[PDB]
Amino acid sequence: AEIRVHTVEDYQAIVDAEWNILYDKLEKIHHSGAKVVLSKLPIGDVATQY
Amino acid sequence: ITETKGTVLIKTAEELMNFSKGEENLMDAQVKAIADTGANVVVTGGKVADMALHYANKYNIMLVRLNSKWDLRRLCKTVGATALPRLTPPVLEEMGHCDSVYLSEVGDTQVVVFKHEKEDGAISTIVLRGSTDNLMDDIERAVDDGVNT
Amino acid sequence: DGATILKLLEVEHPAAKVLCELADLQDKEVGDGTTSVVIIAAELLKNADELVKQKIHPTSVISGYRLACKEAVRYINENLIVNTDELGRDCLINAAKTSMSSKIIGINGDFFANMVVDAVLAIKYTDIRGQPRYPVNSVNILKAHGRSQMESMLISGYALNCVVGSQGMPKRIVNAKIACLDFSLQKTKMKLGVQVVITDPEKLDQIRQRESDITKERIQKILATGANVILTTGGIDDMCLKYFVEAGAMAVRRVLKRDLKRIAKASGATILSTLANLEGEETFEAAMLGQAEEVVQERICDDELILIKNTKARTSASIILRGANDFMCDEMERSLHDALCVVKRVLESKSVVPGGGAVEAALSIYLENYATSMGSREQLAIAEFARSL
Amino acid sequence: MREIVHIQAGQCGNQIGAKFWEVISDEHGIDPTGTYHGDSDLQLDRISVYYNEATGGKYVPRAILVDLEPGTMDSVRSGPFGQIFRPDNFVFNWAKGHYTEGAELVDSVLDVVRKEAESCDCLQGFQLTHSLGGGTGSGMGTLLISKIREEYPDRIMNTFSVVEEAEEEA
Amino acid sequence: PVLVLSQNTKRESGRKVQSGNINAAKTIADIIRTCLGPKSMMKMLLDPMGGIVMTNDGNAILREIQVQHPAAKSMIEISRTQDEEVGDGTTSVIILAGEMLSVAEHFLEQQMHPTVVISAYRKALDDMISTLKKISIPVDISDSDMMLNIINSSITTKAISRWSSLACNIALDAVKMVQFEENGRKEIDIKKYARVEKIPGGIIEDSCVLRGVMINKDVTHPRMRRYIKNPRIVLLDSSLEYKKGESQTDIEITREEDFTRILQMEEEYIQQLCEDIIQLKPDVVITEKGISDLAQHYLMRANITAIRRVRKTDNNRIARACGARIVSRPEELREDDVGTGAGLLEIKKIGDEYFTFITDCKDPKACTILLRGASKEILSEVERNLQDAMQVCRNVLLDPQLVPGGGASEMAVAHALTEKSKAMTGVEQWPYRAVAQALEVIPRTLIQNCGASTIRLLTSLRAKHTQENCETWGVNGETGTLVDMKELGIWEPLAVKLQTYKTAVETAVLLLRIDDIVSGHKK
Amino acid sequence: AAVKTLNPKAEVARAQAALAVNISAARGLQDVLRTNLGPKGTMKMLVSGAGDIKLTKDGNVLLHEMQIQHPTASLIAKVATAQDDITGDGTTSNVLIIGELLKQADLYISEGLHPRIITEGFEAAKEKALQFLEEVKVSREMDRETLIDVARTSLRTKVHAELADVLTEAVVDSILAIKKQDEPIDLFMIEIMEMKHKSETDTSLIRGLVLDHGARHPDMKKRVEDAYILTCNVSLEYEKTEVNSGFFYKSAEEREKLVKAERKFIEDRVKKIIELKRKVCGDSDKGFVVINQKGIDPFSLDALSKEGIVALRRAKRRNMERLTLACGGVALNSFDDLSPDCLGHAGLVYEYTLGEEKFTFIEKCNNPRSVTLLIKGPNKHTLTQIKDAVRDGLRAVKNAIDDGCVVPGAGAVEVAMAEALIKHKPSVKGRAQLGVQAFADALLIIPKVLAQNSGFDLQETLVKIQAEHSESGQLVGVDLNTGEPMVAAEVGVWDNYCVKKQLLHSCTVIATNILLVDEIMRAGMS
Amino acid sequence: ALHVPKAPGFAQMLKEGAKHFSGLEEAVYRNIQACKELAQTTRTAYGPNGMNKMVINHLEKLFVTNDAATILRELEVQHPAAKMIVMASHMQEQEVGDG
């Protein structure tokens, strides 16, 4: 990937988009009712605190 | 992917939020299109992806990966199928038929078997059991001489 | 040549390195007599060491040497001869002959002295007129083995160790218009900061064409003023040689900067590092062109060189030396440099002095007589200076 | 896919190429006898860029060996990992007449590289390993790069070359 | 601990240095003195690379030897200076220098300062030159028989003497066709436009000189014609193919059609170039660079024959022969750059190899000499001999004067100097006579190589020259008698003799001035 | 010595030592090479450092594979190489005659003579011998029987009779089949191929072409009974733009669109070929074969195979001309102007497999101007020997056609020149008569060597041969199975005129140049 | 003592380390010996009652067989005559596969 942008408002939106994506995945996991989560791939500190 | 170098370029946030979802939906559509024809087992000669494996398991598709570039041709001769150089749902003429396909264990060895009931077939295999690799090699040479005779 | 010998030798003793650098300094300052000063200095040391071996303090010897040197320098201005009193041409010729004696060109003294004096006089510069100047080493000296040394020639003009750019060009121009340039004539290339990015494919052909068209436009601008000879320090591309070939003009590349400077000043041209003017556009004006009476390419002993003859803005001279082989040619050049320097010094300062040891004998007699009037321990040092002379 | 073929020229060039092929073979799952032991699939993903698989599971390198000596290629063969090369991938007095020396050697090399490029599907380049300042790298290498370019003037050719008082008015 | 002044420098001085220099010069002279005259024998040399050089040329002998003594190096250098200046006489110069330097130690050992000897030599050289100019003979350059006689007398010493009639004709035709005058009045006879091609095989009598050029090249595509009667030739310095620029350009494509459109524009460019070439309606295209397959297709569609990758010098010779000029940008192609002076283009096979002939030119200014023969060594020797003959012819054309050979000129000059010396007083008289009597080594060596009585023949010849009109009497090298050179017919250019004498005397003067040697100072 | 005082590490051999060294080297070479001459010569085995085996009888191969480091040997080897590459035969006789000339010259030089007298005698004898050879030759129409005789004479000296009889017909037929009555014969139009099985008596001539590669796609047909042939050198692989380019997409759908769009350039050419095939071969009765000098992608291979096309990729460049000459089409670099007039016709195309190798046969051409010689045998050295013999035979037949004349053989010509020179020599003045005698005695070496190899007495056999040809003016040579004199022309032993001419010239020139060397010196850098 | 220096000609012009054999006594009778020994080596593995043979190659790999072609392939032969016999055997194996 590569990001090309012209304005600071779009810059801020781009910054917010990644947090939105990660939180969307986390909420999708949470709303299923699961109480234990296991993964083969790294679980970040943000995910751990969430 | 493209043969030439490619790059995903994004100028807004909606594209960033939609790219992965679109890719996953496209892969799901392709796999279900393959599965709709009635295929039970897919044989490939190269790498498999995690998402493709996930959808194949979802739709109850047996996936076998063999890689010699000659074993693939021999299997095609055995079953009656034609190798497809692009990932597209096969036509009936390109579809192979085998009676039994399974995984078995013989003497600490995991094997995958494609088996017919036909007495003719196209090819056949001889499974040798011995207590020593040298003895098995000698029996192999004897079998070769018999075939040549 | 003493300076050359001492420079080629490798020495480990600093007391000897002092004499080596003394010879080098003499060569830089004057250009003649780099072998006599070493002998004089060594003899002075040898004679002072005996007095030091006797119970004489070195400070007395040093003061005596300083006093003797001062008196000798003052007295030498009595043995002077004013060159204007003598007839100038034979005075200069005799000075040159004396300088060239004891070299490989000794017997040909009159021939080579006439050549040297002619070159030095032709290279004279017109200063503020307070003092005229004679800038030697502005003459180009070339070596090429072959015929006998008495066939070495003086060229009224300039000589270039360069050949024409392409074999399709003419090799002789009668009335020469000269343009001297200080930049390359290759196809253009955008700088590091600039880059080309294409999103509409239809726009590539015209960019590729303009890349080659800019230099053609420059060359047409240059040639529109009637220039016949183009001299360039940078390179010239194969695509750009064809324009000169069709126009019927000579192009020379990889010319040395000092050679270009001398040619430009001799022929009245102006050196250009760019075609821009005091406005935005680029122009070439027939006002900044040199004029020469002939430009030829001449063959010398299986190689080629270029002669530019009878420059009109000023006068210039060059020398081509012929010899049996490279060693002889190099020695001839080294021997000719001394004569050029001697003639320059004589012309700058109109005073000459006899040679053969007369000066040393007179100085020894005078200092020996003068040593008595001191009546001290400096008398011994002064006498030693006189005897070592 | 994207097959690349290799040329080795000269004594030192042959030795360097042999070392490179040895080390790449140990990195992959390839062993001296031409079979496979590697446990990671990533050792077999791009095996076809450097190897041709023969009927029976054996692998051969996509390499060409050239020298004007009957001893260098023999030394490579005697040395370890020298038997894995195909026996016909070798090219072997110095100066005869003929008005041109080496014209048959270069033709043999061109024929062998043509036969090798026939087997590959979508080849992309040639990796040439030779001495640069050497006689075989300048003269006896009779513009072999130029010959290869003339033969295939569309593919890349990557070569590992061994390395004043007058200051008045104006 | 070790106190030194000049580390490991070896110094030698005195009479030892002069004796060593003279001995080294005499040794260099002694190596070669068997290769003078029509009765000379060959020498075979083994070079470091593994070849063989079977030759008789003095410069070829001397340049293949490595020596340590600097006097030997000086003699080796003067040999090649003579070879570059005139091309003939590289053995007589060495022999003469050896004798002129050998006759000096007699006066050195009798406590005579070298400066007197130098002055005497420089005085004698001028009187040598004056006598040589006095005894000259004029020659008419329009007399082909006289020119052939001169060339035959020049090559009657080498191995091509069995085919002198062929060799002389080849050399004369080549020189005459290469002679050129152009813009201004710069007359020149540059011999980089007279190529020599050696092809082993056949017979030597098949050697010839062509009215045109021959190259080792073939047609790019088999369907092109290999025989054209009256062709129109165009020469190019550029490549007929698509190549990248140099301004660091990149392409960014985000649509479907851009890739195919970009791929098509290259073919469009190639077609434009090919059509621009075709507009002139030529028959042959020659280029020093590559030619693409699509360009070949278009040219063949237009019935053109193309040649790839010719050398720059060969392109220049073709241009000078056919009258065309090289063009780098086809857009700037005119009717003037098309050469029509050819008369046949052919492509033949000579022993499993293809060759291209451009022959039957109307007025060519460049030529190719084609030599056939037994093998490379013989062809190389023939090439060297042909170079000697051609340079002799060029010297004759640039200066039409002749002097008798066989030693007649040497004996005449010696007699003149001996007669002039008796009007001199002082110590210089003895060296002045010594040089004149040292000029006799050439007839003495000729007599020795013939195999006769030097003691009798030399004094007989001296007595004959003592008379009044006998300046052309000399030695016949095949039998060993005295003969007038007028009836025999041996003459040589004046420039060769002048260069020989000047080089010999100046080398002796240079070597007589050394007094000490310093070695091992590491730059 | 003078050279030693300047370079102590130099090596030198002066007047007599140089001559001794040269004569010794020449005699040493001829002593080994004299056993090859004639059909009765023996076979030499050569083993290299790598362990390879080469059985040979040819003089040039022996010279360049025997282990020797002598300068005179190098000179003689270069001369033999020139002889070989120009004429194709006579390499052994060159060395034999050079050695005999040097020996006979030294025989007289040892008594105080000077080499120049012998040199002049050599020149006069050479002129007389050339004059005699110009008249002894026989001019004929060069019909098939004469060519068969010449080829059999040239081939019988390398292999046994059973294989020579097989090779002669094939060589003569190929030469006649690629010949037009103008435009001198151009080789490279006969292809030499070797297949390792089916013992050499199966070597044959194919009126077509054999290619050492076959079809790469499994589903392509293995045999075509009536084939159109297309020959091209256009590229059907994926190609990248010369200028740097890259795809910039936004989503997976756009990526798919670009992936589809990056193949139209090659798919267009494939479509053009397919349309031409469907236009010409309407029904499924004929076949279509494509030969390409460049690569073909798997996608293109599948697309072609779906319509019954047999495609071969990466053929050699000379095959572009050979296929055109044989089938009768046009080799083209572009598909812009494709038309049926660019196609060729072939009556049969099929495929053969040898373990790991594959071959393709194009056969039954209408009027082929190019053919192929298919060599077979069970050994690599057998194949190499047969290849060398085939080269010899082809060169001999081509030279016989190029010349209008052929010459009797088996030493008759040497006997005749010796007899003529003996009678000529009294006319010469001076001591050159000794040189003439030496030249004749050197010329008399070939019949002596032939008799010695056949197993008779040299002196008695030569005396009988000279006893004839003097009482009867016939040209008389040696019979190798009885030792009696015979007439070469009636029996059928022939030789080339150009070979003899070149041999005489080269031998005389080399002997004359060798005899005049004064010293041998190695004084350069090591 | 004294030495027998060399013979003039080819014996002196031969390279160092090279070998030149000629005549019936030095070539034919030695080639026959080499071929006879090679045949004797594998004579004992012929027929139903042939005995197995164990060979270790240059890579320390172990072979146990009584097949003549495998034995000859695993052995390394330095004599040219035995090499030609080996190639004859290999050609027979390729052509038929038994014998």
Ligand SMILES: Nc1ncnc2c1ncn2[C@@H]1O[C@H](COP(=O)(O)OP(=O)(O)O)[C@@H](O)[C@H]1O
């Ligand atoms: N004709 C002459 N007669 C006497 N002395 C001379 C003559 N020419 C030069 N000299 C002397 O030669 C010396 C110059 O020595 P030299 O080595 O030639 O130059 P330098 O040492 O000055 O570089 C001076 O002392 C000068 O007086």
Ligand SMILES: Nc1ncnc2c1ncn2[C@@H]1O[C@H](COP(=O)(O)OP(=O)(O)O)[C@@H](O)[C@H]1O
């Ligand atoms: N037929 C001849 N008779 C007598 N002297 C000859 C004859 N031909 C050439 N010469 C002499 O031989 C001398 C040397 O010529 P050559 O041996 O070719 O060597 P170079 O030409 O290099 O000096 C010439 O000065 C010439 O006078």
Ligand SMILES: Nc1ncnc2c1ncn2[C@@H]1O[C@H](COP(=O)(O)OP(=O)(O)O)[C@@H](O)[C@H]1O
């Ligand atoms: N059947 C034959 N009877 C007599 N002489 C023959 C016969 N065949 C060939 N020759 C002679 O053998 C000579 C040499 O031929 P060969 O041994 O092949 O070597 P090369 O051809 O290289 O000299 C020829 O000159 C020929 O005359």
Ligand SMILES: Nc1ncnc2c1ncn2[C@@H]1O[C@H](COP(=O)(O)OP(=O)(O)O)[C@@H](O)[C@H]1O
């Ligand atoms: N039962 C048997 N009785 C007698 N001879 C046999 C029997 N079986 C095989 N043979 C013989 O063994 C011979 C050689 O067979 P083998 O030992 O396998 O070596 P190869 O077949 O390679 O020559 C054959 O000629 C065959 O006749």
Ligand SMILES: [Mg+2]
């Ligand atoms: Mg001075």
Ligand SMILES: [Mg+2]
């Ligand atoms: Mg000469």
Ligand SMILES: [Mg+2]
């Ligand atoms: Mg023969």
Ligand SMILES: [Mg+2]
């Ligand atoms: Mg069996």
